[PDB]
Design an enzyme around this catalytic site. Structure first.
Site, short mmCIF file in Angstrom:
data_model
loop_
_atom_site.label_atom_id
_atom_site.label_comp_id
_atom_site.label_asym_id
_atom_site.label_seq_id
_atom_site.Cartn_x
_atom_site.Cartn_y
_atom_site.Cartn_z
CG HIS A 286 39.46 36.68 38.23
ND1 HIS A 286 39.09 36.76 36.98
CD2 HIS A 286 39.25 35.49 38.33
CE1 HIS A 286 38.86 35.57 36.45
NE2 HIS A 286 38.98 34.84 37.38
CB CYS B 163 41.00 41.04 32.36
SG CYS B 163 40.62 41.06 34.25
N1 LIG Z 1 39.07 38.50 34.54
C1 LIG Z 1 38.03 38.69 33.50
C2 LIG Z 1 37.24 37.40 33.17
C3 LIG Z 1 35.89 37.54 32.55
C4 LIG Z 1 35.51 36.21 32.36
N2 LIG Z 1 34.16 36.61 31.38
C5 LIG Z 1 35.03 35.09 33.37
O1 LIG Z 1 34.07 35.37 33.98
O2 LIG Z 1 35.92 34.50 33.59
#
Ligand SMILES: NCCC[C@H](N)C(=O)O
Ligand SMILES: NC(=O)c1ccc[n+]([C@@H]2O[C@H](COP(=O)([O-])OP(=O)(O)OC[C@H]3O[C@@H](n4cnc5c(N)ncnc54)[C@H](O)[C@@H]3O)[C@@H](O)[C@H]2O)c1
Ligand SMILES: NC(=O)c1ccc[n+]([C@@H]2O[C@H](COP(=O)([O-])OP(=O)(O)OC[C@H]3O[C@@H](n4cnc5c(N)ncnc54)[C@H](O)[C@@H]3O)[C@@H](O)[C@H]2O)c1
Ligand SMILES: NCCC[C@H](N)C(=O)O
Lengths: 135, 681, 678, 262
Positions: free
Chosen positions: B165, B261
């Site tokens: 991300h 996040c």
């Molecule tokens: N930005 C954090 C997102 C974490 C989540 N488990 C995912 O993999 O989308």
């Protein structure tokens, strides 16, 4: 050779009697000696203007159906860059990396072999003999 | 009155694995330390802003990561569409919250993944949006972002799966500052960053800080909140007026997220200027042949993605027999025109064509300076090529790679000829861009394709010490260097050696200079990816572009003076006035105008700078190393680094008292060298 | 039906106008139409002395119309019209078709885009017993069943692997009285095996490269007469020695375009026997594969695998999937020249996730183990991937998955058990899976140096042999991989080697190379492959274990040539020392290494010379046991290995860094030179 | 040879009364980037800690080049701090590791200056004779003559090791399994459950272990010969990673990057 003035004069005078350059001279095979930074001398025949050397290389590459690149990274790359597709290319070198780089126009155009260039030439000539023996 | 959206960890867990951090950590979650770490963030944030909450839901543990709920600007929000179905169920709950707080909600097509503010970060002064792609958000969602949020979108490509991300490696701060981790981005994206953010506002963090989710920072005015920070990080942040507040978030680093996040700022800066601007481009190409078994279609898709674009296969026509030809139509997307050009060039080789109603004439630009192509000139290949001139397809003559294509009207008709740069003449028309070019390759052509480490640390110790001793004593050190120095990462270190007084002269060839300049100017280097350590296949456009540009400025020194060359080996030589010689070679592209193609003179110039030399450092140059060797009397210390053990032995005829050699990676060598030199102060 | 009739076409419009085979390369417009006319007249007129010759009307723009051999294939009143691969020849087809129709033949036509190039690529047995059909460059394998049905004849498939010999009739020529003129190197190992099964050794005339590149196989055989371009007189003596009369007539202007005597003719009167009927060995299996086929290039990898192994394919359908990230699905009809090749192919597609169409699923076939540590013939060879097998209409998981084992099915309290077992662990009474049904998975020294060491070592070997002294060879499996086995077995047969010390591997691969022409599934005819299956490798180990020893493998006749064969037949003692990575192992292999060292030592007594051929582990082992005074010759491509082994100095240690195969090749050729004053 | 000596035989000790009778003429004579590498190390190190925390199983195969290149101390450290549940090798790795810890030498290699040396056989046989005297490596440790290094750590933390014999073995050590059927059975036995296999310059043992190992097992192959690293990566870029460098270099980086993870 510098005293004589050229490789050909070395052949005319009788002091060069055999070898690769001898045969180029005696059979009128055009050759080009491109200079480099580590050249000793150099020979009078050697082209130390590399703009010109590239142009001479290019001129002699016109119409080539095949290029034998025998253990010469700097010159084989130089020649590759000047050569269009459709020209069979045979690259012989003991370093696998050199042969990999030169051979990237694919199997129908690039043939590469990793071996001693001398052994290669020895097998090549002995093979050419075998094709002659039904006469 | 800032509002953040969060979600309590009441049903938090690691139920599955969809990013690398989650690996192994299934049912390894302590709900109570999660609850308590979450509170620390919660409590700290309400001390500075309004926090709203989403109702937690059993079966969607990642609901706590509200940054991925969507992207908010003004009264508009673009709802996240998740790639993995493990999270798709969160979408109605996130949608319900947004619509219950008045927002106008836009939803992407069900086939364009886009994962919210977590992957798309606002410039804090609200000038543009940074949208990421690579792993979760599709490139093709970006023009929907611009359209719906009415803002300028800048695409960044993510290349490291750890930072899947954007908000885990990229973080816009107050008053124009930027906290980012340059190594999560490709060369094109880093360049975008540097050209929008002035160097004094850039805060590039080290890998140590980055794996602790340092970029995953909530910034409320002058306050920044995060998990952990090295004090080297805290130092820079305070150094411009940022107060750093830490708080443990380790139980969430195990699902893949941290402070940012867990939050979503829903009060955002709507500006004045902004309007929709997208740089993303799209093109439909058609490819025909034995697509499935030649691996033609498969190599095309690889070039597209690896160069930084995306594809959608719109349709497939399967031939009836093995020898029947098949056809495919593919929509290609690129983040900019420049990358689209890169992609179409590679595809032209594979024989991709315009749909016959979108055929267009090649674009032409005049040469104005002898030996210099106009900017954005097409770079020819080895393959037989046609170009389209006023409606007619014309055969290119004298085809050669790494040339330009010149067009002339002659008494015998249109003439298209391939010419190397230095043969171009003022007045000639030259193909620029990538329209009206196709290849005419035939079917079958197209359908085809010793030294110990510890030994090394010994030498480095020896060389480093003798190298400082000579510098203090005002001595003379000479360097000969080949392009392998650049390709292996050695460049920055050799830059450093020159910058801090260790190098009185530099001797090399055309290639080292072109490669060093390419790398500093575009972050690439022909034939080599110096951000992942293996070879790459293309790269010729960047390479010729550097050559054409320096030739345009007329010298390397004027490239530097004009500011287009701002860093690297040749830069440092010019800045500290270190004399360099570039001796020509039979394989030279261009050449650069600095390159000495008269080799008698080049030898005289090399000799001239070798006088007085006390040490000679020979860095993977073989040819130039020998040349320099022949010229150099005894009493001169000679250090020979090469990966080929054959040249290192070839260069050590001066016994173990004048010549030392090692057979390793020269980049490795120069790292150790620069480290051991630091320990000496 | 005793009058012989040929179709030809005069060269009125003949030239080389394009390139579609390697012979035409560089020859565009280099044909002399005068010599071409004169050379075609030589052949035309000789032929008219022995047979009827009809002519097709030459046609402007279709220069290869002179090669009537590719017009089609005739048997009795039927002809299968050829469909050409390249469009440059496709315009010939209507003219050929109309000639055939005008002469009353029944004309069968293949589906469009299914290439088949006539008698040029399919050659009848001269007694009319079957039809030899080629594929690999022009004709499709899947044309062959059409030939069998329509011409009503048994069809045998041969795979061409050399682009210079792109038609069967350039490298293969059935002759009167059962003889066969052919070039083995133009064919893969399977095809050579098939040729040797059907034609007795005294009937085979295998020719040399020098004859093959003159198109010696491109021969017109009328009765006891053979007409060709040029024959070496070694080939003349072989042919006249079995009663043929050799007629030469120069056809070089036609060689420039890739054809010669046989290419220029087409026999339309062929022997038709009533007892001869349609028969097909070509098999086909529809297969299904799913995933991101375009991204991962899995579809490409599997199709390439099918073609490399000797099979063919036809993609029946491709389903893109309805959204950008959804998976693709392809259904592929896979075909193979025999059942044997289909098994190697299907094994490789299984390993990759290919599955049967629902309606084609069958249970795994089972055969019992009768001897401990021995699988039944044709046992399936397992991979690293998780595997399920269909027993009694149900799919069960395989336990203890491991590559290169067998799959044993056994009955237990609560249910059936499928487990992977290495061959030596198999127990009598166990059922083992055979065939490929009901199996699926879930996702350097200089030239002058080399030449001087060869001279020295060859002179040394000749000298020791003549004196009755003792030479010992230590060798590793690279001697076989690189291609050097037949040179070593020659050394052993001619008496230069008194003992051979090695390991399990070198024996397995040498026996594999001689039984199946492969080494680790790599066909030696081709050089290398897209890796290669372990099936050949494992069958060898199993077969020798069943026999009980290498010698029994020789006594029984299943091992007929190679290094181990020569050791057995000339009673050269050998020792196979075991290692941790041994497959099997062979019964001959000594897995007690205390004993192995003692046996090594015993066989090293009295050695005057040791040849260490590319074997670090064994060469060091042998060095440590050997006192000074023993000449040692170390051959390896790694300079470090040779350096270490060569430290007893020049008068005892000779080292050369080179490919061991090339070395052996120069060594034997050098030993020949010492013999020639006799 | 040592193992053929019988109680009661007289044996020459010291160096008096020995000469050689050599004749005159006999006597009168005599591809992987560094940065690529740092990449892999980062990847391996991280997956290596994750497996340790999660109570997983890591197996190591190692050859003597590990000792010769300085890798020894680092592999000692990996075993000592919980990263290695089993060790598979041959006679030579054990003899060389023990030689190095006991006498600071290693036959054929100077591990204090990084190049090869010519002699060293006395130290080597002395280690073999001594372990054979104590009757096992574990009793060498217990008796205090073995105080450090790879085999030491295995015994101290009770990490199972297998030493499979070979045709080139000196001695052998009494621990070395010279019955290769059994050695294969023993290797297989300790490979069960393995989640990662670390292959450190062993070529022969690496392949052996490879044949035995099902898919789903992460395999890391370090060797200086680029030919064996390629030979060991048939499991695609998702199960097998390889690098062509110095294994000692590898293990240094590995142990450094593992420290940065706490
Ligand atoms: N930005 C954090 C997102 C974490 C989540 N488990 C995912 O993999 O989308
Ligand atoms: N006396 C002089 O004036 C002088 C002397 C030396 C070089 N030069 C010039 O330097 C330039 C570089 O010359 P270059 O092309 O030979 O160097 P190069 O760097 O291009 O290397 C040639 C290649 O040969 C390979 N090689 C080594 N041994 C081999 C073997 N047995 N078999 C096959 N390949 C082997 C090497 O891997 C190398 O890639 C030349 O132009 C040369 O004329 C001049
Ligand atoms: N199927 C089986 O049961 C099986 C399979 C493989 C190995 N093994 C056993 O493993 C043990 C190791 O065998 P090994 O002695 O072959 O391995 P090795 O480590 O001793 O290597 C042999 C040497 O050959 C060199 N080499 C590679 N290519 C070469 C070439 N063209 N020319 C010359 N040298 C070349 C290599 O540098 C190497 O030093 C053997 O005892 C073997 O039987 C058994
Ligand atoms: N055997 C004759 C075939 C020759 C022809 N020129 C071809 O390429 O098909």
């Amino acid at each position: 050779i510098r005293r004589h003035g050229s490789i050909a004069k070395g052949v005319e005078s009788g002091i060069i009697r055999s070898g690769v350059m001898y045969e180029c001279v005696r059979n009128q095979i055009p050759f080009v000696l491109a200079g480099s930074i580590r050249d000793d001398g150099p020979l009078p025949d050697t082209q130390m203007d590399l703009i010109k050397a590239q142009e001479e290389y290019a001129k002699h590459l016109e119409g080539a159906e095949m290029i034998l690149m025998l253990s010469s990274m700097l010159h084989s790359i130089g020649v590759g860059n000047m050569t269009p597709a459709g020209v069979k290319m045979v690259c012989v070198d003991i370093n696998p990396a050199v042969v990999t780089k030169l051979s990237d126009r694919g199997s129908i155009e690039s043939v590469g072999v990793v071996t001693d260039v001398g052994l290669f030439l020895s097998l090549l000539t002995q093979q050419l003999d075998k094709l002659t023996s039904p006469y | 009155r800032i509002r953040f959206l969060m979600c309590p960890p009441d049903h938090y867990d690691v139920d599955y694995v969809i990013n690398p951090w989650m690996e192994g950590n299934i049912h390894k979650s302590s709900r109570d330390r999660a609850v308590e770490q979450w509170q620390g963030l919660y409590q700290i944030l309400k001390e500075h802003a309004i926090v709203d909450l989403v109702t937690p839901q059993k079966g969607w543990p990642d609901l706590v990561f509200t940054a991925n709920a969507g992207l908010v600007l003004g009264d508009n929000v673009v709802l996240s569409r998740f790639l993995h179905k493990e999270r798709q169920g969160e979408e109605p709950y996130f949608k319900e919250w947004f619509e219950g707080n008045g927002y106008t909600v836009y939803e992407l097509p069900k086939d364009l993944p886009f994962e919210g503010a977590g992957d798309a970060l606002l410039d804090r002064e609200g000038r543009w949006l940074w949208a990421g792609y690579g792993f979760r958000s599709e490139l093709d969602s970006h023009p929907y972002l611009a359209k719906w949020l009415d803002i300028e979108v800048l695409s960044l490509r993510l290349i490291d799966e750890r930072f899947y991300h954007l908000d885990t490696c990229f973080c816009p701060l107050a008053n124009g500052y930027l906290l980012y981790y340059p190594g999560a981005f490709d060369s094109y994206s880093n360049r975008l960053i540097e050209m929008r953010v002035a160097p004094e506002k850039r805060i590039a963090i080290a890998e140590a800080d980055a794996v602790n989710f340092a970029c995953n920072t909530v910034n409320v005015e002058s306050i920044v909140i995060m998990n952990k920070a090295s004090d080297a990080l805290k130092q820079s942040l305070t150094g411009v007026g940022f107060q750093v507040l830490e708080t443990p978030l380790t139980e969430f680093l195990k699902a893949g997220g941290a402070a940012k996040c867990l939050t979503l700022r829903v009060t955002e800066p709507v500006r004045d200027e902004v309007h929709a601007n997208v740089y993303v481009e799209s093109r439909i190409i058609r490819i025909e042949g034995h697509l499935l078994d030649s691996g033609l279609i498969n190599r095309a898709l690889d070039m597209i993605v690896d160069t930084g674009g995306s594809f959608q296969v719109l349709n497939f026509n399967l031939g009836e027999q093995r020898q029947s030809t098949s056809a495919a139509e593919v929509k290609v997307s690129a983040p900019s025109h420049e990358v689209m050009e890169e992609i179409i060039s590679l595809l032209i080789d594979l024989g991709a064509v315009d749909l016959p109603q979108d055929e267009r004439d090649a674009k032409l630009e005049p040469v104005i300076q002898d030996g210099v192509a106009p900017d954005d000139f097409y770079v020819s290949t080895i393959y037989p090529t046609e170009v389209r001139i006023n409606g007619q397809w014309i055969k290119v003559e004298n085809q050669r790679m790494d040339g330009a294509i010149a067009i002339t009207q002659t008494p015998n008709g249109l003439l298209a000829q391939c010419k190397i740069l230095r043969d171009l003449k003022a007045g000639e028309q030259v193909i620029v861009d990538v329209l009206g070019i196709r290849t005419i390759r035939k079917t079958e052509s197209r359908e085809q394709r010793v030294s110990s480490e510890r030994r090394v640390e010994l030498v480095v110790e020896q060389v480093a010490w003798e190298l400082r001793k000579i510098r203090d004593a005002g001595g003379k050190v000479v360097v000969t260097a080949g392009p392998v120095v650049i390709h292996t990462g050695g460049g920055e270190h050799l830059s450093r050696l020159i910058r801090e007084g260790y190098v009185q002269a530099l001797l090399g060839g055309n290639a080292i200079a072109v490669h060093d300049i390419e790398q500093n100017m575009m972050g690439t280097s022909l034939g080599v990816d110096m951000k992942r350590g293996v070879a790459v296949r293309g790269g010729h456009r960047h390479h010729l572009k550097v050559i054409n540009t320096i030739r345009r400025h007329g010298s390397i020194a004027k490239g530097v003076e004009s500011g287009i060359i701002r860093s690297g080996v040749m830069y440092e030589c010019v800045r500290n006035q270190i004399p360099f010689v570039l001796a020509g070679s039979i394989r030279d592209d261009g050449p650069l105008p600095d390159t000495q193609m008269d080799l008698i003179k080049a030898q005289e110039e090399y000799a001239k700078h070798l006088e007085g030399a006390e040490m000679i450092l020979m860095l993977s140059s073989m040819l130039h190393s020998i040349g320099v060797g022949n010229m150099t009397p005894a009493g001169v210390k000679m250090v020979c680094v090469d990966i080929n053990p054959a040249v290192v032995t070839k260069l050590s005829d001066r016994g173990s008292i004048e010549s030392v050699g090692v057979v390793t990676d020269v980049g490795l060598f120069l790292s150790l060298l620069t480290q051991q030199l630091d320990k000496l102060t």
